[PDB]
Each structure stands twice: as structure tokens, then as C-alpha cells.
Amino acid sequence: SMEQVAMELRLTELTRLLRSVLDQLQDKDPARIFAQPVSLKEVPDYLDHIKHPMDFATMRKRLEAQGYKNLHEFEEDFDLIIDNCMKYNARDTVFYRAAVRLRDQGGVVLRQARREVDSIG
């Protein structure tokens, strides 16, 4: 149907906007602490602590399969990156502090992304 095509164009354009959002958030992580999944070879107890691991690469795979239907879904995965880190690592660690800085800086980007998603529809 033409309606199904129109919906697919909207999903494609959301995917475009979320790709740009993902790039901007990841630039707020120049240390690359959140770039890849926590290694279960190197942190073998991780899944005892963290039930839903997340990282920028895993988000990027979901994005390229147009697997985010709306901004809320995408924000959920970004919040897991931050929140997982802030639970597993103590306040006095470079990892925790990196997550705080990512959250604070990412807030700015996400605030305007929400406006754009509503604005364009």
C-alpha cells in the first residue's frame, strides 16, 4: 500500500535524525568508554550485576536495521548505557565520572532532538 510506504519513509527519516543524534552523543565520549559491549571475558561476573547491557555499537546495529520506532526507544537504550555504568562502577572511578559527563552533555542534544521529532512529525 501507499500508506505502508509513507510510514516507511517516516521511519527512514527518523532513522536519519537518530543517526545524527547518535553521532553527537558519542562525541561526548571521547575516551570511547561506551563504544563497545562490556567484555564478558574480561568482566565475567557482569551479567550477575547488569541485566540489560548496552553500548554505542549495539545501538548502531539496532538503528541500521531501522529498529527504533520512536525517540523514546532510542533514549531508553542511551539511558541504559549511563545507568548500567553508574551502578557497576563506584562514584570515584573514571568510568562513573565518564557516564555523568555523557549524561549531562547528552541532555542538551536530546532536548533539541525531541523538539525536531515533534516539529517534523
From Swiss-Prot:
Coiled-coil intervals, chain numbering: none
Residues of the full protein shown: 555 to 674 of 1058
Cross-link (Glycyl lysine isopeptide (Lys-Gly) (interchain with G-Cter in SUMO2)): K41
Gene that this sequence comes from: BRD1
Subunit structure: Component of some HBO1 complex composed of KAT7/HBO1, MEAF6, ING4 and BRD1/BRPF2. Component of the MOZ/MORF complex composed at least of ING5, KAT6A, KAT6B, MEAF6 and one of BRPF1, BRD1/BRPF2 and BRPF3. Interacts (via PHD-type zinc finger domain) with unmodified histone H3. Interacts (via PWWP domain) with dimethylated and trimethylated 'Lys-79' on histone H3.
Ranges for domain Bromo: 9-113
Subcellular location: Nucleus; Chromosome
Protein name according to UniProt: Bromodomain-containing protein 1
Tissue-specific expression: Highly expressed in testis.
Function as written in the Swiss-Prot or TrEMBL entry: Scaffold subunit of various histone acetyltransferase (HAT) complexes, such as the MOZ/MORF and HBO1 complexes, that acts as a regulator of hematopoiesis. Plays a key role in HBO1 complex by directing KAT7/HBO1 specificity towards histone H3 'Lys-14' acetylation (H3K14ac), thereby promoting erythroid differentiation.
